[PDB]
Paper text:
The challenge of nascent chain folding at the ribosome is met by the conserved ribosome-associated complex (RAC), which forms a chaperone triad with the Hsp70 protein Ssb in fungi, and consists of the non-canonical Hsp70 Ssz1 and the J domain protein Zuotin (Zuo1). Here we determine cryo-EM structures of Chaetomium thermophilum RAC bound to 80S ribosomes. RAC adopts two distinct conformations accommodating continuous ribosomal rotation by a flexible lever arm. In both RAC conformations, interactions with the ribosome are exclusively formed through Zuo1 by a lever arm (residues 253–371) that we define based on our structures to include ZHD-αIII (residues 253–289), the entire MD (residues 290–354) and 4HB-αI (residues 355–371) (main panels).
Although a previous study suggested that the RAC-ribosome interaction changes with ribosomal rotation, our data clearly show that the Zuo1 lever arm anchors RAC at the ribosome with two main contacts (C1 and C2) that are maintained in both RAC conformations independent of the ribosomal rotation state. However, the lever arm undergoes a complex motion, which can be described by a bending elbow located in the MD (here denoted as the MD-elbow at Lys305). Although, in RAC-1, the MD-elbow is bent by 37°, it is straightened in RAC-2 (main panels). In RAC-1, Zuo1-ZHD interacts with protein eL31 via a mixed polar–apolar helical bundle (ZHD-αII and eL31 N-terminal helix) and multiple salt bridges between the lever arm (ZHD-αIII) and an internal eL31 loop. Interestingly, the eL31 N-terminal helix is rotated by 50° towards the ZHD compared to RAC-2 (and the idle 80S ribosome). Furthermore, in RAC-1 the MD-elbow rests on the 26S rRNA 3′-end (H101), with Arg310 seemingly stacking on a bulged-out cytosine (C3324). Another striking difference is observed next to the tunnel exit at the contact between Zuo1-ZHD and Ssz1-NBD. In RAC-1, this contact enables two salt bridges of juxtaposed residues (Zuo1-Asp248/Ssz1-Lys255, Asp249/Lys259), which, due to an increased distance, cannot be formed in RAC-2, resulting in Ssz1-NBD moving 10 Å away from the tunnel exit. Rotation of the entire 40S body, except the ES12 movements, in both cases reaches ~7°, and swiveling of the 40S head reaches up to 18°. For better comparison, RAC-1 and RAC-2 were built on the non-rotated ribosome.
Numbering used by the authors:
A (entry chain C): 3 to 298
B (entry chain D): 9 to 434, 439 to 480, 523 to 566, 571 to 577
The structure:
Amino acid sequence: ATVVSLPLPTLPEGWAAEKDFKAIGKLTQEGSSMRTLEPVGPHFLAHARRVRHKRTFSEDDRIQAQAKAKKIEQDSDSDISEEEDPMLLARDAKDWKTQDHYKVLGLSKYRWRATEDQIKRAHRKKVLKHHPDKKAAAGRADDDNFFKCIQKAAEILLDPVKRRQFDSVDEEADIPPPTKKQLAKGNYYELWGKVFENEARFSKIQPVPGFGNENSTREEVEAFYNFWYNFDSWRSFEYLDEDVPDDNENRDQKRHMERKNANARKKKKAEDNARLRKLVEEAQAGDERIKRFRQE
Amino acid sequence: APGERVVIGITFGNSNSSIAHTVDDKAEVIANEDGDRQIPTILSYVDGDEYYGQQAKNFLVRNPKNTVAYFRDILGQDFKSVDPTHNHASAHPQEAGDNVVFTIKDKAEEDAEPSTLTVSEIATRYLRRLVGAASEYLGKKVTSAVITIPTNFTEKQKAALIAAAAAADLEVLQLISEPAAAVLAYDARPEATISDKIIVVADLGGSRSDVTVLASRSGMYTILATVHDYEYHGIALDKVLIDHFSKEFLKKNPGAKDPRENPRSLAKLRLEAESTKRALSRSTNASFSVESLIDGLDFASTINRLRYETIARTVFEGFNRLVESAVKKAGLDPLDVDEVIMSGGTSNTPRIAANFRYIFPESTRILAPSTDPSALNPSELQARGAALQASLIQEFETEDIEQSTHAAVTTMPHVTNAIGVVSVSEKFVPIIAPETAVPARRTVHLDAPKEGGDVLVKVVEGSTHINVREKVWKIGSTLAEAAVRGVKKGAKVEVTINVNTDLTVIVTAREVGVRGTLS
Ligand SMILES: Nc1ncnc2c1ncn2[C@@H]1O[C@H](COP(=O)(O)OP(=O)(O)OP(=O)(O)O)[C@@H](O)[C@H]1O
Ligand SMILES: [Mg+2]
């Protein structure tokens, strides 16, 4: 019995009940939950003694259905998005930096959107199916190139920073400029907002506002404009960087190449900011809400 | 026979195994002929003689085609699900029927055709050797054992294990999970105190990592979650150290051929990196020395804790992301966890234990060798818990065990929310902890008012809520209201809540009385 140094409420005046007790509520099956115990330990053995006394022969088959209420094991599809990879992607000749990703791991329709568990699960499926050890007799020695591709993709994508940089450098899933003259009649209040969510990947604040519709309030539209105007990209493009000897004649050599790398990345980053603002401006010019707002 | 049997506890992992017995109701781990208590799960054949353990690992380099290892997972598994990544060293499994097989030379004569032994045959032989070594240590013939297994062994794998034991003349009384063995190893100690705790079992092995979340109340535990990661581990640290040292060899000898291609060099480097990492765990500084690694040339170096930690930092945050992934999968918060036990060989290293100490608040107790004086060996936890279970279960008969291990006994209505009493001052006090299985009677002692007299005990439902971080209780539906008349000033009021199976709730508030029933 646990002793706790906390005081009880004084009884209000004029309160009574049969034997000074009042029943208000009860526990429900929704207020409970069925989990299954592990048959280990002296207290479980004593509980098993009591149950064997109460029921003798156990109705395992009958209570299996009731045990089914909660399950703590799961299985997944063998290949959710089986990709043909024509001719083994033309035998997928090892070409570092150039090679695409996500498609080899068969996570297409997800790309930047994924979770570690899904990534590892896909990795294991891919390695098991294509591992040379398992199917070597059936001419898998040739598929060593693809196997190295699998490992390179796994290492590039599992580590958070490397995956984030690869995503920014070449997602290969960016939609073209919205509401082009050919794509006329697409709603300016929907297509553009969709582009914003598709291009909010690097947003430093999670509750990103939305374009809205014809009736959207002034405060919200203004906040949306301010947020986009004052952005803060974490993005950068280093997967395409020039290579250097892994064993490098000490610190000096890395700095010497870093020079070129730094000027290239800064100019590139500036150009990316330029394009981003150029889109923001196109949207500001197109948007009609401001034109009515100023006249009023 | 019930009168006469010999039971032991066995832990059987991918990397290593262990055996244990009980002396004077205290579990002790058995050392084999080589003096090892953590016996590598490796088998090797030389001139038709069967060797296992340290001798086999030493002979690994010498015998390329006669060593088999990491076969624990392969047991009871189909060809489609075979995992061959760690099996490159081991002989290539050949798909014969539905049972993959290893082809090795187990005969003594040099011109004999190699045998094609099954994985079941190999597990059987390994269990014979383990039982035999236990037999020499005990002076008696071992007849029974409880063996630990992970929670994700399929029924086919369990059947394969029991068939292997039967072929090894060993009857398995029960299979228990490693988290259950680890918790029992502590709970069954003389000094242990039973109490409601959220327990995280982190079993960090060689080829695998397991994080399991359990609620342990009234000396009985309920599984909330479990995760198993195959990517980050001590073998991966072994590869990164082999890489870095390979670097150093390449720089020291300009032009030297790359170590990776030669299998002999690969095996020598891994074994020596394992030795060095264990030494650096042992103390502040460690040394690495390889003799005739290539072309008869020799090499040495020295490494220290901090540098090793820096070169191995990424795996540490991999373990971190795994542990938060597990807690999120269990729907809990680090403020909700009470104790985290570090199990397995990798758990010994101080840095990981300190890292979990930095992740979790100070109220959480980390049971790891380097952060607690009363901790037990993480490599001995599973084997001692298995031996303790194999000891305590001796009384019951075989049919009795089959009945005690059926679903009709283990399954019962666990009450999700909490039951407590409202305290007011000029707050929810829990009596029945949340997620508690049916009749777990509890009792609290509360303070009387400033002067006392008539006092109101209002029992309500309760739920946990996290406020940004600090955990508070939230009062929900009201269950009962009772009164105690004329309580003395400064006296204590005893309140008992019993939520019997039938879902009947009995409430008692006696001063040291009012009683009530909720159907
Ligand atoms: N003497 C030792 N003390 C502690 N750890 C060791 C020792 N020798 C090796 N190790 C390492 O400890 C780890 C083994 O931990 P653990 O006991 O959890 O594994 P296991 O029981 O063999 O297998 P599993 O991971 O499948 O449960 C490996 O990484 C191994 O390299
Ligand atoms: Mg282990």
